[PDB]
Amino acid sequence: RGRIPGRQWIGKHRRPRFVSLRAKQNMIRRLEIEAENHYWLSMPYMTREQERGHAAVRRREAFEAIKAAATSKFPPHRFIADQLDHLNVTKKWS
């Protein structure tokens, strides 16, 4: 006795969830810190025209750095030392 049809949380009839002062407090907290965010997002410092073309140089140079990092691609160098170090497996005392 006391069951509900089908799955518990979906369909035309489901288990009725209810709210608690716990969750209400939590979400009022979220939205009041969101209102503080609204306030601090207001009152900007500069305008579009003031902030238009100041960081273009930095963006450009960073992008050329990325370009150089991508272009600088080769196999690594090969060395006679790395080749002949393998002979040292048959080392033995006289």
């Binding site: 489901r14 009725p16 709210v19 209400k24 979400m27």
Partner: protein, 37 residues
Amino acid sequence: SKAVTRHRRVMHFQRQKLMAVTEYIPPKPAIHPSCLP
């Protein structure tokens, strides 16, 4: 299901929390307006 239904369509839990937060809190004085005034 559909939006418009004969029955009251059970809503999302966040929506129900929102509706539980938003109500008409009537402005009441600290003193009842009959006994004192």
